[PDB]
Design a protein around this ligand. Sequence first.
Ligand code: HEM
Ligand code: XE
Ligand code: XE
Ligand code: XE
Ligand code: XE
Ligand code: XE
Ligand code: XE
Ligand code: XE
Length: 148
Amino acid sequence: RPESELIRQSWRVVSRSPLEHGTVLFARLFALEPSLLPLFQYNGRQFSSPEDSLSSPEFLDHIRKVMLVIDAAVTNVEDLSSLEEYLTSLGRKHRAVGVRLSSFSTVGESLLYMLEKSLGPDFTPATRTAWSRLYGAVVQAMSRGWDG
Ligand code: HEM
Ligand SMILES: [Xe]
Ligand SMILES: [Xe]
Ligand SMILES: [Xe]
Ligand SMILES: [Xe]
Ligand SMILES: [Xe]
Ligand SMILES: [Xe]
Ligand SMILES: [Xe]
């Protein structure tokens, strides 16, 4: 597939510096949906402001975890059915921490933002479309974790 190749090529640029790129993704996310901030409760305390989250080692580790899951999705872009069961359980976990299924579309827009910013002129409409479809497949598998 040509879509598969657009994904693997663009991901190559981003995955050189995953924390730097993942920081962009979460900075964008909190700018779009500030009500996601209290869902990161480490030691039972809440971040007051989005900049607080950036000095938390646990929060930075969660950015690394995110980037690892995307990496696994890119690795298996040709056959995602093998990640399906892990992704369902990952959805169930996020339901438990208080994440609403609707928030995963803001996460989707934040990922596209971070790609657009990182790739500039190389972020073509074909590339955008490919990532959108892949993210779509990932969300579908995760959404099974929300009971339905
Ligand atoms: C709506 C945005 C999200 C919020 C508020 C959020 C919050 C959390 C919290 C509070 C935990 C448990 C504490 C921790 O491990 O840091 C967690 C676990 C995790 N999250 Fe996220 N998360 C979000 C989105 C994502 C996305 C999009 C991915 C991957 C694509 C992801 C991957 C993970 C992984 C891999 C774990 C560890 C799961 C386990 O094995 O227990 N999260 N999430
Ligand atoms: Xe952030
Ligand atoms: Xe931020
Ligand atoms: Xe971890
Ligand atoms: Xe990572
Ligand atoms: Xe990565
Ligand atoms: Xe993501
Ligand atoms: Xe993805």
